[PDB]
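Page header: ASSEMBLY MODEL / three components / 924 residues total.
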Amino acid sequence: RVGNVKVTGDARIRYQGSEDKGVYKANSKSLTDGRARVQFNANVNDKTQAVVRVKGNYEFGDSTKGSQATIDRAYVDHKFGSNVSAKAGRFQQTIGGGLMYDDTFDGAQLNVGNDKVQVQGAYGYMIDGAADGNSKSDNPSVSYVGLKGKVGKESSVGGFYSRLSSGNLNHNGVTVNSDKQDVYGFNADFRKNKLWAGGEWLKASNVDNSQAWTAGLGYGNYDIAKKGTWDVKGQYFNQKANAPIVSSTWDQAYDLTNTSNGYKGYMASVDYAVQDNVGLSAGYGFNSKDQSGNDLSDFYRAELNYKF
Amino acid sequence: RVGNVKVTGDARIRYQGSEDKGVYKANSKSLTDGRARVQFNANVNDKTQAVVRVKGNYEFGDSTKGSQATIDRAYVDHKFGSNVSAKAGRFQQTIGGGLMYDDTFDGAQLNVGNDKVQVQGAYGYMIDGAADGNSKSDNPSVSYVGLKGKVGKESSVGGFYSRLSSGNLNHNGVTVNSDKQDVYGFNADFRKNKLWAGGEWLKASNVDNSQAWTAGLGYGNYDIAKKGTWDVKGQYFNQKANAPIVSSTWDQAYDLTNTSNGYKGYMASVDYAVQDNVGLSAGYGFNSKDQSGNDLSDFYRAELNYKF
Amino acid sequence: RVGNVKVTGDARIRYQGSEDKGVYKANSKSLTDGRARVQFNANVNDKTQAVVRVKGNYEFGDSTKGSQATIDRAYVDHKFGSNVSAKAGRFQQTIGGGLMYDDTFDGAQLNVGNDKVQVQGAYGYMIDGAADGNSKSDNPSVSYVGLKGKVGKESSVGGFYSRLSSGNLNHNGVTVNSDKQDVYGFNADFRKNKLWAGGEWLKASNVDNSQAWTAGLGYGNYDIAKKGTWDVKGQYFNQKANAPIVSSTWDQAYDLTNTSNGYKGYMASVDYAVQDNVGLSAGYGFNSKDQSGNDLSDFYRAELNYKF
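Prediction written out in full:
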């Protein structure tokens, strides 16, 4: 009865809030929602594997529509030896350290690794974030190349260079057409014992006021599979008005789709594995301001993550 | 290749009809449809489990839209010992004996059992029935507490008290805003040998003409997993105009969404397991009348249930 | 952890193009898309099985909407002995050799085989093709009976007779109501060693200019599960203006929904299994013309199929 497909997944019960209305839910300052994902990992052969993930989001109490299931991921991974790998279809792409974009991606990905230095090249389109709601003609294409070297036993540094074509992006709720963008950046990720010190800087060369950077300190040994593991970190975000932030890997409430004059503030988050494969995560963004000094709304998070 | 997720499901081919048009399908007196559900039961750890169910409904011959898959269930079950259990997310809630509501429920559920007496407390929102099509602000919240005691070896009696906040409910196809409702009720379920005698009574204290009750007799040993098992029962429904019937557990064609002056009539249903995990079910509602004596339309059912 | 359900599926990355715009994508002459399907094969009992398939289509770069998951197949298969089989629900029906229709089908199917001669009878509605977008009342019902005999060790010939009721079909993008149609046809499928020579002819007796036929030659031993297997074939299509072509089993770009005066041209396609359960398929339709001699647009195909 067993085949080549292995079924995994996760469940999440998340709470989001803010001191002002509209940050997470329209005309309100709170949002409680749940997520259920089921992933099918299939072994096509010894060197080829295919991953299909079905995802469903619902809001607690929202019965206007059902929780429609959408194919979040659909891609095939090829292992062309021991150092070369390739992806094609609908997968997850991390542009740089994830500050610019870490979300769904349609296209192809090429990997050339050496266990101490890694080269990744991706060509395709972004799906979520400011790239959401764009047709194929209106969606800018991303030609991304990235370098990642291991500076220590587990610390790593790297950089990237990306090229975005003309397309429509969501700027403060308004889709505007932008010219070509050449986005380059660098990142660092140091991890000594339990201490963590990471940072990332990115900028679009041709667009002014496009600089965005982040930096944070952490301490912990969090692992959702191990009970009792905990983590604490506090990171600072400084992104300008024209900084390309489509779907960031971090949990700040402000990106290109929500801000018209950039974002600048701190965020403290904690993690705790209450049980095995069960983790409690909380976050609190404070001192949120625009690049002109205008105060923004403080935001806070609390979610429960179940892994199976 | 095996993980923590076990895949189950069911399939149904159902036929519904009536002597008048509009009871089941608009502008017609018949409805043939099929249902396919796939459920993923996952063991997060020794004391935590998560259930995700994907459901798809289609009509025989309706090709206007595809059979969109919706996440019917998405919840996590915790076992806090041997007597305390907890649920959270999108699950199934039975308010009382199921006459008032037995369908999808967003919120949290707490269980305290003793193997002879059980206490269940739920807080959240109803999704299907008269609560369908309501946003989070317009969906009334349910604060439900229920008691269930075992009066015999397998017979049981119980009661419940529910509190519904202000919200919009579907009354005869029209969504009207209602004030707070305090719904209380009692039920009995006697099962001696093969004979079954059950009944339920519920009423909203502050709303007049809100009384609803049912009673039925049965005889059989139906079990879909066992071939040759059969069941027959005949039950009578008497629900008034303002009686809260959102999504009843029984198969009467008339509830709050379809009736403007209540429902009152009999219903005879039969069950038969033609094969293992295959069951043939039929039903026939007759003598359907309003609370004022106006005749309603007789309805009849026939479905095939496949379990896997 | 293992149950009665076995999980299979497939993934596809397809490219389609033409010399004229609108053949595959509106206002463009190209279309790159991907497909991911997950099928759940369940054993209800020793003689009953149920199949549920979840399907998701996405376009590379189209982020206007998510890849909604739809239940492509939902049906139950019964084995009433060793020669009689039955299907019910949403399955795949091949009307004749597949030239007229080979796609989703709602209804019931009966099979009576003898390992050398087979009789198949289906009653229901077509879902895809020219039958897409039709409600239950507007969808014509198909009463189909088919005969298939084995003329050689692996060659086979057969025929069919179909009866279509009044209903709406998509004719060149316009849904028109048509009277009853009695469609009959014959087919032949010869397979000697690696050579293949097949053909099919169909016609609606009461509709004029409803004749449609195809013929092709092939050579290969293609099997996606075996690496290195390859196939080549070239087939010719001659279908008239009123010929019923709802969802053909072949890959010609022109059918009843796209053509107003029929289709007539050649098509050469190749297959190659680059890896185990991975296959590369290409096609090229050329010399496309109408039944009046007006030139149509040449089309070409290229897809990658992954099986798991």
